[PDB]
Amino acid sequence: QIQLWQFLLELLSDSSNSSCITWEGTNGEFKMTDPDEVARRWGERKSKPNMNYDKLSRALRYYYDKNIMTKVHGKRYAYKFDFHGIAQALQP
Amino acid sequence: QIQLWQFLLELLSDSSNSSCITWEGTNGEFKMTDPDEVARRWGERKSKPNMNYDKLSRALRYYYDKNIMTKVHGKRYAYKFDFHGIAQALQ
């Protein structure tokens, strides 16, 4: 029942997934160093094997007005978690 | 009929298709510079619309454990042929 933003947090919290996703700095910004792999592993986790990057991207973009996550303007495959929103949600 | 991985080698062997697919380096890595066009052409050849990159990419994944072709991890549309397997499968 896990949601996408949590799964990314799960991957980032585990230093070993740096092969495909990694922290950038310390203020909640991250980079998908292997975007196709992030989409494939999110596919495994949610039992949806036609998961691909286009669909992963569409889901990430959906969060833009939901105090979850926004896409970083200068960079490719970069997002920044909404610090206040993620903090708030990660309690209930 | 012809199989997907063969059709890709066919496109790669012909210098004029670099607009959509091209060899990268000399160890069997290649890049699809226009993935949608590669898919469109694979669509006509196997007389199979509505072929698109998503169905194509998923088909390529079949090869990853069959000593034909593997997907290059840092990248989006770059793949690498298995020389030994390609050699053996051909004869």
- The tokens for A51 are 């998961």
Task: HSE, CB side, 13 Å, CA atoms: give it for residue B54.
Answer: 12
CB-based contact B37:B20 (threshold 8 Å) = yes
Q: What angle do CA B68, B63, A51 make, to 5 degrees?
A: 150
CA distance B87 to A52: 31
Say which DSSP state B34 is in: S
- The tokens for A6 are 């949590």
CB-based contact A78:A71 (threshold 8 Å) = yes
Q: Tokens 């066009």, residue?
A: B37
Please name every residue paired with B70 in a beta bridge, in sequence order, or none if there are none. B80
The closest alpha carbon to B83, from B5, B3, B1, B14, belongs to B5
> How many domains, in total, are found in chain B?
1
- The tokens for A24 are 């950038």
- Comparing alpha-carbon positions, the chain A residue that sits nearest to B73 is A34
CA distance A34 to A65: 25
- The tokens for A54 are 């286009």
Could you tell me the residue range of the domain that residue B14 belongs to?
1-91
* Contact assignment for A19 to B73 by CB distance below 8 Å: yes
CB-based contact B1:B47 (threshold 8 Å) = no
Could you write out the DSSP letters of every residue in chain A? ---HHHHHHHHHHSGGGGGT-EEETTTTEEE-SSHHHHHHHHHHHTT-TT--HHHHHHHHHHGGGTTSEEE-TTSSSEEEE-HHHHHHHT--
* Contact assignment for B73 to A35 by CB distance below 8 Å: no
Indicate which technique resolved this structure.
X-ray
Domain CATH for B80: 1.10.10.10
Smallest CA–CA distance, residue B54 to chain A, in Å, is: 8
CA distance A69 to B30: 34
